[model samples]
Target: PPHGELQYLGQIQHILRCGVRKDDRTGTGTLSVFGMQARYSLRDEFPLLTTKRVFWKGVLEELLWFIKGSTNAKELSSKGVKIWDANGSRDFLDSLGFSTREEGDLGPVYGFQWRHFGAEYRDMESDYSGQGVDQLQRVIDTIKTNPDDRRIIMCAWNPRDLPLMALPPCHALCQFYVVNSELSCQLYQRSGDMGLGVPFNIASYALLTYMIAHITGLKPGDFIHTLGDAHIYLNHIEPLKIQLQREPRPFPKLRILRKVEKIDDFKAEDFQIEGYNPHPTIK
Candidate 1:
């Protein structure tokens, strides 16, 4: 198997060479394409990119926050992770009629949807009582009791809640599969900004698969990522091309230092990566 996240590099190169320039929602045009897939073996090595530095702590914290079913950014911000700051800004929330929203409340985002999907979502402050299905818990239970069940899935897209959200989910839905005691995951992302978002998405989902496998008593397997409307923003083309010239180093191995029983119990301090040497930050 190939070492490091060269597939990511390859994808970037493919898009730059052949993608068509198209206008986007953000008003920054992009070299866009459709229907791309990348696979990584979690058993062999962690698929963090070596072409550019990926803030792994932020990645883990975000995943854990989602698993904990948290919709607010306070937990992540408290841990010094500010990835969600742009989306959770007070001004943005106020524009959406969330006039009384707290500083970091992202109204019913990924975490809320994962834990309480299809529920009656009042504003960020109102209690979400007797609402939404806990898809995460159901998938975990299904994985443990019926490993071969084909219905092991978690969805983050709720049409009802989307209007309340600051931004719709890009990495929308994912499904888990188990075979011979090994657990694998597949993610379907409706929109992916290749330059900035796709790398983080890959690591985030890979870590999530590892954590879920740890709790379910199964070995980590392949992470299959499928994307729709993949594009690289116009301004990011130069830095991305610079990134493409760098060689991919060997991938690092992820070590969970403690024996955590529950997925939500995993903290940023509990995880470590060995031999992660990468090129300078592109930005």
Candidate 2:
């Protein structure tokens, strides 16, 4: 049966209950989350959050930032997106014995891997920005245009750059696939902070699937999330329990502004949400 309103939250709650916790580079976090796999149909409702006001703008910007293969948090921080504030640039600079400046600088992790990494890891790079290219877009386009191509993938785990990264990539690597022209996406997340990161992963990847589907004349299909380590931090258990006690509201609909053709063409002004009436925010 469909989870109705608690779709995203429900999946999260289940993972928390079942996943194992462990100590890692982040001190303490979860491990071993069971990723759901299914051949989701495109005719169904887009799997977005209905219970809280998710930052669609931030999500888009962050995804683009990753596609751009940027590690600097300045662009996102300037816009008030604070997800990476705790450990973005200052920590990395401090470790390197350099005084942090106004423009925070962290080593390249996501963008570097996605765009210019050795082909031994990444499959292809194609033109999206006209100046250079976007690996994420290339992956999406291949899945949409050529399903049989086995190389439509993106990777964030670079063994050479691991020591420089503040926090290792969570949703690390992913591959896009098409079967019978149905656009499908699979995310291979290396680590997940169940309370925080996992939900964002689901929404972000699902949205990516939707955007690629729209651009390529295909319907959004399944999102297969595979995880190497997925877990809930001990601090988040209480908060999650409180969240589960409350009833979920309605699912909000995402309305990307018209005339948006390619993913690179999206901007903060080009998106809006409608019909989102959710319960009070849980901290």
Candidate 3:
């Protein structure tokens, strides 16, 4: 019942015991380890972590926001998801030398790079119709037309757009695979904030994989996450230790409520996570 989540719990334990002390851009110290990977089966049950109550609403809403190809955090914030609220704050934007940009304007972040990879980014308010490469669409088309193609990739790591972004992409690129009518995804996340972010990314990608699979008419396979810099923040140490003490519960099943043909047609209420009896939140 709980094998999938053990991989996540084991990763937390590994980083804590074996990581080295390191510094970060945020000035917060971390116990950092380099190069780690975990595979969670997305075929049967969704790999939402069970040790702690991850913000499912936040995960769902934020991802849908990304799917909409929005660089404006105000849209996501207005929907009651404040995950990007801090990054979109005026104070934070001013600190990043983005005084000219609007408060919720996260320029050329994940959504832009996913949907409009090479488009000239003016502002979040600017319309970007029929511009740049639509990698999300191409990936789905390839899955349907050319399932054997090895180049089914959606990338968000545009070096040219780094300075223009509020935050550099973490789960920057992901590639899809199709074999035996099962769809698998491999995410290449350069930096993983082990305590808080990894669990969210895990579910986020799994949901994406499931959505694509559903749209492409294939069975959900596996989500293989490969991280380059996996770090546990110094502040999250004690809480994570308490988290590690708990046994993982069973993962839940993800059900799509209606038949959604197009990827963009799906809404927040379309998904249902049945039997998601997770442990309480750490904080």
Candidate 4:
């Protein structure tokens, strides 16, 4: 009866009980722990955390935008997801010493690193086709061609290109695994905002695992999240307390309506989350 949601809630409880208080770059204090790990099953249900409602539209659109190899936050914001707005603003870019970068250009961030890892760091408008190692496609191809190969990985953290990005990658690297016609993913996140972003990250990577599983004609196995610094913001303490008390409902099942041949072929409309029953939004 109690499984995925319980596992997540347990993590929150553990953090609240034992986390060390520390200050962050945001100047906001956090109750932080050194390392953590959680696994959500994608066997029949999508792990879109039932304690609170996650922004599914944002998740879908953002993932799609990433798959398209776009580092422009304007592209996602144009579709009504404003999560990237603050980071991609002109003022923010200027403060980061990126005076020449156009607004909304998050230089060589997650999308660019995923699709074009070693490509030259031109402006976001420049095309990078046939350049760099297309890790996404390579992972998919390896899954199809060599299922047992342990090197099937997709990474987003590029230290060489770190200084150019607006916001550094948090949920940085992920490795794909195949076993008995099942596909699983493990994400190594360098940092986590437990109250706000961790739930979203869970759904994001689970959906990624599902999409890859579908494309490769394999079953969605599991999404394993490993964190280096998992912390709850001091401001979010009370809200997380409230959320922790709210019993988790059944997780929703994700349905892919279309037969997508390639990973990049997935559209927002092509994926569906059915039977989602969450308590309420926290903030």
Candidate 5:
């Protein structure tokens, strides 16, 4: 378990096996998973699952989609990403008291609030549209400028719009701390589906931390993930069991193609994966 891959995935698997399940308006689902605190010094590799091909493209694209301040799934599907398939169904939004024209829109979710919360953090009612990566920059700037403020935080959970969302936000809040110029990020996730969601959640946040580190001219730090409702879906159990039986390969290295100074400037082609030799696809 001390190995890199196990240190990352094993911790999540344990949380999934031990959390709880519940039903909600989005669908009848449960919560039974938890993510760990970031310990960057303990591991250098980002632990995206090497047992299966986790779609790095979807992660980047969806992040950008959220950044675009869009609420539509059509753009994602057009790019062959299907993470929002179930949420896009007409009957699904109808059940939530919204029409296809309204609820189906993905809108300014996490990335929107994180990067551009607007006007001195006082205008709670304002819709800020500037590039969302500014929040990350602010945190980095605090580390470079203030270096002692414990309030270096970024939140994606907008309380006002939770009712209008197709799905409740998962990676709800994150805080970054600097100790002696070392930057570390800790993410608090209120709910997580271990089978499908946990893997991607871990990778996405970890990459965010890395990217921030790169742009800020600081060494990449530990990415800590904390989860509340972490559970495996009944439908995903068999595949996870199959995964448990196999030996996971080494953690792969992720390469961002350019020196990204801001979040809006990132393109799909800006990221690359290298030395990722994962196990065969799980059938």
Candidate 6:
């Protein structure tokens, strides 16, 4: 099970060894690779990496915010999660002609897409009634009643709403499968920042799978992370090399203290990680 963490490190090493150099939108060129896939089994251990410290609470808060169908970063910022700070910055907002946008308003990002796909989004405060499909709710209901249904899916990419978004969804689509009373999830991320973003994506989706499995009355299954354009920023290469050299500690065990039936009901306090001894934080 510890090897699962090693697999992530190995992927970073693989990128360093064979990835092609390319300029990205961020202007921080990367040693980029086309496609990559990694799988982690929830049955063994929680997939949070022990190579370097993963921001576990930030991950949970972001996921919770997404599940709550929120597009504003205010809620997350209030809770002390600063991951979306740069994306929702005032400068960034004004550049998109959203000069009047309230601080932390990430107009129609992940959460909005997940809970209200294809909706006509006017602004952060506008009512989105009868405008979108509740993809998350549909997926949950299907998992409960039609466990074997082949079409259990949730998407966060909408072409119409792309222009309004602060940033297009990276880990865009996810599909769930229920087989033999176990629930498995697969995520398709169109763009992944291998050194920084990919680790968070892995843990976030894995936790989502765990939470969904818990509420759906099924055992946790595999989390298959499929990526497109997986790459490490050139500046990240040295730091990542240092991370690779650090031996992985044992994978942590995630415990849900109280049984929360609804995904929205689960809070940060409800979750705890045991036996998480990781190396020093990167940067």
What are the Cα lDDT values of the candidates? 0.82, 0.62, 0.89, 0.87, 0.65, 0.84
Cα lDDT tens digits, model 5, 60-134, are: 777766555545676666667888656565667677665634434554555456665432332113455453455
Q: Between 2 and 3, whose lDDT is larger?
A: 3
Residue-wise lDDT of candidate 4 within 57-160, one digit each (tens)? Answer: 88888999999999888999988899977766788888888878988898988888888997888888997998798899899999999999999878888888
Candidate 2: residue 103 Cα off by (Å):
5.0
**How much does candidate 2 score in TM-score?**
0.78
Residue 215, model 5: lDDT of: 67
TM-scores for candidates 1 onward, in order: 0.94, 0.78, 0.97, 0.97, 0.80, 0.95
Q: What would the per-residue lDDT of candidate 1 be over residues 1-283, giving only the tens digit for each residue?
A: 5654777887788888999999976577889889898887788578887787888888988888788777777767777788887756778777777777776788888878887888776655667655778888888888988898899878888887787787798877998999988989999999888888888899999988888888888898899988898899988988998888888888768887887887877877877888888788847
User: In candidate 2, which residue pairs clash?
Assistant: 30-231, 31-231, 32-230, 69-111
User: Can you give the lDDT of residue 83 in candidate 3?
Assistant: 87
- The list of candidate 5 runs beyond 4 A from truth reads 12-44, 89-91, 100-104, 116-137
lDDT score at residue 167, model 3, on the 0-100 scale = 82
Ranked candidates (TM-score, high to low): 4, 3, 6, 1, 5, 2
What's the true lDDT of residue 71 in model 5?
53
Q: Show model 4 residue runs off by greater than 4 Å.
A: none
- After superposition on all C-alphas, the RMSD of every candidate to the true structure, in Å, is 1.7, 4.8, 1.1, 1.0, 4.3, 1.5
Error of 3 at 278 (Å): 0.8
lDDT, residue 45, candidate 6: 78
Report the error of model 5 at residue 151, Å: 1.6
Q: Write the per-residue lDDT of candidate 6 for residues 1-283, one digit (tens) a residue.
A: 2478767887788888999999977577899888888888888578888877788989988899889888777778778898887756788788778877876788888888777888877667777766689888788888988897899888888888788788788977989998999989989999988887888889999998889988988888888888898899998877888888888887778888889998989888988888888888758
What pairs collide in candidate 6? none
